[PDB]
Design a protein around this ligand. Structure first.
Ligand SMILES: Nc1ncnc2c1ncn2[C@@H]1O[C@H](COP(=O)(O)OP(=O)(O)NP(=O)(O)O)[C@@H](O)[C@H]1O
Ligand SMILES: Nc1ncnc2c1ncn2[C@@H]1O[C@H](COP(=O)(O)OP(=O)(O)NP(=O)(O)O)[C@@H](O)[C@H]1O
Ligand SMILES: Nc1ncnc2c1ncn2[C@@H]1O[C@H](COP(=O)(O)OP(=O)(O)NP(=O)(O)O)[C@@H](O)[C@H]1O
Ligand SMILES: [Mg+2]
Ligand SMILES: [Mg+2]
Lengths: 445, 446, 431
């Protein structure tokens, strides 16, 4: 558009000179296009919009070669210079202000069925690639291109699908879940209301998968934030325009005092976000969370909420014992063809919701037992009677041998609420004080 | 008004051109309307007001299409451009300043009987919809149109009334309370002084009901702020223009050490509000508070006044299994017809105070024992006399067998303050004849 | 004054046009009054003063209709626009600067016997209502007119005096104290060196009385600051230009670690006020403090000063039932007749010190026992030589979950009060 703008500026200056010649030598050779006329020409021959009618909304320009509207001031300034190079910063700002006054108001397309990709928009309803148009209002797009694939790319005899199988210890459910996780991380307007956790005992390829995701998706489109940092002030502000958020390494067994922000982000509920020395507001973040960590973080809520939000991926394979192929994480996942194929395969597959692998359900139960001492006690109870409350207490098996703090006669109510037998009241099996509950009995008669 | 101002343009400019022609070629062919004349034309042909005479207050323009006064400088500058496009930003500011000097002073309409709606203004005294007029001064309105509704809209064979009944587990009192809450949430000038709390274990529709409210009401008319965040600095500033505040998820058992701002916002009491790098001032907030959480948070204030303000709504419906429908939260209640019907029904019904369901009273009592250990001990006392005051303070029967914190014999007055039952105050000298002090004496024979 | 300034501007513009005509057509014809001439005209006709000679102090203008000097630059710029509509913000600032250079300096009228009221100034010594004049320098006034009242105004069969009696649970001392509190709150230049605290639990009407006070007085004339908010940054800037400060709900039993600013504000003690990124300065605040809360918060200092500064008002009536009438706090206290009668009754009442009710003295003693464990011990202990036995760790902290001392500061108990000596006599049920 540089040539077109230079050309239009040339005839505009020529017309101004002709009018000055007709009117006589009085305007001392006017050679600079007035900012209002410059804005008129730009609006006529380019696509400028305004995202919102709110105060100090920055004007957006449609980059034809990129297909996404940009609010970057310097790009617009360069465009002005293309039309009129003699305007300084103040006159270009005046042109921008005039354009802001002229252009119409259009909201960004937040349709979950449309995903911006480098080649163009992708429609999930038709599962088809559509060329970039100014009608589709996007501010960012997936870095990697989208072309039809027929064979699995291989570099130096290394296959991406074989690596995916190797990551999951050759489990169809886990590789399917990983592909679904990639596909969900691609979508920014839809969240699926699940939290993805990667657990790793060592060199399990977790970081390699994180870098693969950060490469297939735009590196700018991804945010970095851990679970324990969600409640911290100004941390949520990084989730503004990011397609997904990745926690690189959550500390092992970290304690989250409050996860209200984390749960709200996971379920897509609106949340209060503030910037540094900026007014507070509320926004809805549909970006998915993907946290890679060793072990498993411990939550404070201890309720069914965090149980329903979370999803765990085993990542059992250990590549530390096998020879480490640094080229996989440094070269192979950065190859254009591999990212292309990954993007194509992930975008084509369709699923309404995450399908939990059988390994994840066992891992979810393990997390439930470890986080909640009461549930772990109930699972490992193996007791036969039911009436004696203090026998049921039994000091809870030395805090389930995991020294997790447990209350008296209050967590008993929590246990009975959590869990056929219900409660029984007998005067011959209770109030005997056989044990003054340290405790070594397991089962009585 | 764009057409009207454009017609006003090229006419005043024509007038200046003719005057310059008559006076001779001396003014270099003036073509820009002077900012003062621009302000005169705008004041004559539009409605600009000033909310108050305070320092550097912002001019307000009546949007004829929207029907609400706005202080957004961008819209005003766009209108000025509609009149005189060639004005710079500084010239637009000059026009705004001249208008500020010229226009009159009128206060915002804050009568509780008038509710701004997308379609018009609803009058509760006459229960009627009236067209937008510049006389009514509103800065925001409900984003749902008000239309006459006779048949409940069904989308994909799904009924909103049936969903409301399901959320309440088919309880008439609870559905009535939910409708009353919907009605109260959209009134920005009347508070009823009740703190609505949604309690549920999981997948109970708490979040669905909250974003349903955020849909029927304007999204920008809702402020997201939790109970524990009321007293943090700069947080109250979000309540400036919002008709309701919604706490998406209050952490379970969070200790609210200070409740002054929250209690003030619940009632019609004024509060000190401060913006970021802006002078502090005093404002009254009538927005209703609605908080959804998994269990009632612990409040430091054990006094009766904190308890009376709180209201608790049971969400006892379970949708954890295959019964869950994503379309309900994501699609169905974003439908325009459903929102219109909900707005109509909520606006129509009239009441003076919340009708407390029986289940709410039970849960309010339960939270009363949970928050106040002495009240919990009294409820679980069953010790019938009470002359030996020392056995009564047996760590209040070891926290009535639970856990907590106790004061050392300074809570004696608290027991009488909580209740007197029927024995009132009873202490006799002969007391010392009972053996001192552990769980053997849970009976009245003493 | 709009008509006068419009006429003055028109005649000045005509005179300038005549001068341009007689001097010949030189350049563009003058049509805008120069800022210096505009300032000259404004100074000649209007009334502009300067409160002090400090750095960049703001010019004050006397509003003839309002009767009070204002420093609001918006009003001054509107007046300038009345005189000269063609001046933008910079030219109005130039006019204001010229006026600041010209006008004389007069201090604010801070006479405790003069109270600015919407009808006019009120002379307490004369007990009269004097009309507004520019001679009296005031920056704010009570938003309720002062009219002579003879018969109590009743709205919907509801009496303000009967409601006041109901709030006090039918106690003459308490209603007298409440009227005295209203009178003290209205006066902004006299402090009486007492802190008013509304102590009551559950529904009592403390907030209703506070709203009545904020209604009879100007709403903008009331500051909002709880006792615990006094000592942090930028909070005192709210107190500037306010006749009284009201704390809506102090947290129950809040720990007031720092009370220096609160004590300074309670008395006439000067204090350093700071604005947000504005030149901080020293100032004296005479506004009275009124706080409402459930129970009496305890102070760290627990000394004589906080005891003598504090005053406690009983709110024992409960309306937590069908007795509650919302219209009392929503509509009844907003009635203009009721507010006018309340203002008349309060301002005509005269006194020099607060009349302490007997119940207030009892609660003051109770708070002294609660905040200071030593005095609670002294009250509870109802011989002389034995100090160790009477100590006994405050006889086991007098059963209040307190913390004791090392038996060295315990003898400060004879400060509150063991007449002095045996040589052989110097948990436990036990004096
Ligand atoms: N097939 C393979 N795929 C990926 N990495 C491999 C493979 N075989 C060996 N490796 C090596 O295994 C290591 C995996 O690195 P990385 O995935 O960052 O580890 P991690 O411990 O999971 N990282 P992190 O998530 O931050 O804790 C690197 O040294 C790789 O070179
Ligand atoms: N009557 C209903 N039938 C089926 N699904 C429903 C019904 N009501 C709500 N849902 C769905 O239940 C899901 C969860 O509702 P939501 O209110 O977000 O949960 P929540 O109660 O906030 N969960 P939690 O924070 O963990 O306690 C949403 O997808 C709703 O669409
Ligand atoms: N004499 C009265 N008779 C009946 N109702 C009254 C009376 N005085 C006040 N009320 C009402 O009682 C309520 C008092 O609320 P308010 O004064 O804000 O709180 P409070 O009673 O001081 N404390 P709290 O109950 O914790 O909010 C309002 O509804 C008043 O209209
Ligand atoms: Mg929820
Ligand atoms: Mg109150």
């Amino acid at each position: 558009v540089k040539q077109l703008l230079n050309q239009l500026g040339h005839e505009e200056r020529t017309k101004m000179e002709e009018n000055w010649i007709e009117e006589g030598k009085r305007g001392r050779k006017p050679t600079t296009i007035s900012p209002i006329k410059c804005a008129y020409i730009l609006n006529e021959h380019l696509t400028f919009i305004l995202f919102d009618d709110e105060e100090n909304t920055k004007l957006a320009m449609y980059q034809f070669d990129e297909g996404i509207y940009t609010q970057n001031t310097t790009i617009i300034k360069r465009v002005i210079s293309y039309l009129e190079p003699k305007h300084n910063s103040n006159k270009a700002d005046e042109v921008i202000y005039h354009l802001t006054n002229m252009v119409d108001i259009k909201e960004k397309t937040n349709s979950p069925y449309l995903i911006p990709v480098k080649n163009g928009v992708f429609n999930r309803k038709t599962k088809q690639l559509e060329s970039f148009t100014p009608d589709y209002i996007f501010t960012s797009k997936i870095d990697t291109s989208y072309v039809r694939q027929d064979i699995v790319p291989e570099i130096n005899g290394w296959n991406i699908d074989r690596w995916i199988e190797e990551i999951a210890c050759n489990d169809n459910q886990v590789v399917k879940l990983l592909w679904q996780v990639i596909n969900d991380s691609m979508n920014g307007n839809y969240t699926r209301k699940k939290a993805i956790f990667f657990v790793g005992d060592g060199n399990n390829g977790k970081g390699t998968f994180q870098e693969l995701l950060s490469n297939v998706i735009g590196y700018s489109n991804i945010a970095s934030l851990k679970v324990n940092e969600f409640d911290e002030r100004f941390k949520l502000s990084v989730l503004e325009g990011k397609t997904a958020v990745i926690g690189d390494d959550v500390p092992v067994g970290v304690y989250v005092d409050d996860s209200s922000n984390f749960k709200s982000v996971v379920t897509g509920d609106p949340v209060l976000v503030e910037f540094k020395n900026k007014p507070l507001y509320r926004a809805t973040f549909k970006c998915t969370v993907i946290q890679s960590t060793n072990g498993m973080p411990k939550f404070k809520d201890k309720t069914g909420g965090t149980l329903r939000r979370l999803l765990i991926v085993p990542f059992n394979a250990n590549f530390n014992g096998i020879k480490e192929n640094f080229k996989i994480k440094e070269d192979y996942i950065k190859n254009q063809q591999v990212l292309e194929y990954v993007l194509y395969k992930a975008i084509n597959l369709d699923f309404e919701t995450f399908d939990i692998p059988d390994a994840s359900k066992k891992m979810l139960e393990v997390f439930k037992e470890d986080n909640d001492p009461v549930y772990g006690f109930k699972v490992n109870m193996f007791d036969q009677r039911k009436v004696p409350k203090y026998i049921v207490y039994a000091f809870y098996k030395e805090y389930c041998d995991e020294n997790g703090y447990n209350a008296l006669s209050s967590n008993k109510f929590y246990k009975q609420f959590e869990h056929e037998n219900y409660w029984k009241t007998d005067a011959q099996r209770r109030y005997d004080n056989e044990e003054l509950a340290r405790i070594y009995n397991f089962n009585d008669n």
